[PDB]
Amino acid sequence: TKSYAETYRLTADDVANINALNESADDRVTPPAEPLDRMPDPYRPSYGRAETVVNNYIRKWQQVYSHRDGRKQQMTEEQREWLSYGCVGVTWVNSGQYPTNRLAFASFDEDRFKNELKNGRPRSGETRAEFEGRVAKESFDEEKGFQRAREVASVMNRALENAHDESAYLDNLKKELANGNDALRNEDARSPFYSALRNTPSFKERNGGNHDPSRMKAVIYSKHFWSGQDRSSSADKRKYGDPDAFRPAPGTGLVDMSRDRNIPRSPTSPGEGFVNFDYGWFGAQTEADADKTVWTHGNHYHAPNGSLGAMHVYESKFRNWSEGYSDFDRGAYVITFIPKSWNTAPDKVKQGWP
Numbered sequence: 243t244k245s246y247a248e249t250y251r252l253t254a255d256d257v258a259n260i261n262a263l264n265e266s267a268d269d270r271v272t273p274p275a276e277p278l279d280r281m282p283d284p285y286r287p288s289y290g291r292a293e294t295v296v297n298n299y300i301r302k303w304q305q306v307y308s309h310r311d312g313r314k315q316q317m318t319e320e321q322r323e324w325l326s327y328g329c330v331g332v333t334w335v336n337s338g339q340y341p342t343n344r345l346a347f348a349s350f351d352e353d354r355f356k357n358e359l360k361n362g363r364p365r366s367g368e369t370r371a372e373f374e375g376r377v378a379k380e381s382f383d384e385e386k387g388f389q390r391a392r393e394v395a396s397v398m399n400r401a402l403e404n405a406h407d408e409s410a411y412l413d414n415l416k417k418e419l420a421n422g423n424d425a426l427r428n429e430d431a432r433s434p435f436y437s438a439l440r441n442t443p444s445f446k447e448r449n450g451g452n453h454d455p456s457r458m459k460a461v462i463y464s465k466h467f468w469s470g471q472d473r474s475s476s477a478d479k480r481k482y483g484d485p486d487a488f489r490p491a492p493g494t495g496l497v498d499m500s501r502d503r504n505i506p507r508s509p510t511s512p513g514e515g516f517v518n519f520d521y522g523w524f525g526a527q528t529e530a531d532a533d534k535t536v537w538t539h540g541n542h543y544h545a546p547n548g549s550l551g552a553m554h555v556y557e558s559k560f561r562n563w564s565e566g567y568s569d570f571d572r573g574a575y576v577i578t579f580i581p582k583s584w585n586t587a588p589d590k591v592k593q594g595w596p
Contacts (some may be wrong), residue, residue: 246512256550257515258278260542263327264518266505268548272323278316284512290562292593296325296544299555302595307336307355309585328543329552333408333521334446336538336586338444340482341521342553344434346497346574347394349386355485368534369375371476375483376589378469385532386563388464388524390495392577393458394426395526398438398577402455408440411455435496442579448582458579459526461587464563466535466570471505480508488572498576507569516569517542522558524589525544536591537563557593 245259259268273296282301287295294302300317308315311314317325317335324329333341355377364373399413410471415436421429429435439458444450451457469487470479476569490497506518522537537558544553564574 243416243566243568245514246520246569247515249567252517252542253549254513254515256542257517259545259550260328261506261515261518263543264330268396268545268550272319272326272327273545273546273553275316275319275322275546278304278314279404281305284596285594286427287593288555291558293554293556294595296540296553296555298595300325303335304359306588307586310590311494311583320408325540326553327542329517329519329521329553331543331553332523332538332555336523337461337523339578340444341463341576342441342466342578343499343502343574343576344441345390345438345497345577346434346465346499347387347577348488348497348572349383349385349390349532349572350494351381352488352492355381363377367504369478369482371478371482374485375469375479375571378483378485382573384464384573384575385515387490387495387561387573387575388462388532389562390460391577394495395462395577397422398460402439402458402460405455407453408455411439412436429494429496430533433496439579440579445579446582450583451579456548457582459587460577460580461526461580462524463576463578464522464524465502465574465576466522467502467572467574468505468507468516468518468570469572470507471501471503475503477508480589481510483507483571488573488574499574507571518569520567521564522569525587525591526535527587527591528589532560535560536593538591539563559593 280301283298285292304317320334324334358377397418401418402411405411405414426435439445445458469486488497504518507516509515522539524537528534540553540555542550546552
């Protein structure tokens, strides 16, 4: 299907600039402060997605998502700086940390993969590596992967409910997993799964979790990315994908994200480039129907006076999000934690502004 660059009319320079910034920590600009008394401009969803210029998004975020212990606050200079990075900025601000992606889930149909590889055939004009990459891509199920993350997040939330130290949380978590015959029960003590809470910087902060699990909430976001990131191996894997990379462990659905290096797909035709990743913020919406949930994501980093243009923040229904692009053949559903006292992951998220 269409590339990110084709969809947004990004030039080769645009793509190179996006990739360069996304691999680091037409220059990026920090949007200025928006006063609390400046109300957002109205905007409305169209065909599953709403979008607004980043300055207006800051206004909306300040009215709704900014709350700490129930009270609004201006998005700080540092937060506006984070936000300005684009794709990643929304997730960075809402979680209060640059995404590590350590605890990640996906759903892969091994049977369909094996079958299509044996009984199927490369399309007329398709190379071997193109065929294998595509079949691997199609064998993921993002709805099932998201559902897995939600199920594990609910289990993790129940475990922290009345737990006032990490040991109590871990004890609740293990008992819960044992009872449900979940393969996650058998993860090592230092695994990303078991260490996710204590790995969260705000868990330790006096003003955040203060080492008290009950003060925290599990939250979910998604990363879309490229499977073929090994610049030392075959050009075929770089351009067409690595069928064996970033597959979920069959027992648990856990994806090992340690080899993710923010490296984009190699061009398949000269001039036509790919962006390295996309991030989509879900948070903790109560809506049971996955297709009704809202995923928040900026289009690219903020360059209001340059070729790239001002950053615009999109609020997309899940199907709009999971559609993806030719740039990405992998999706991970990541769990992390934030203090309950924040409001960056509310029960209901509404597209636009009335």
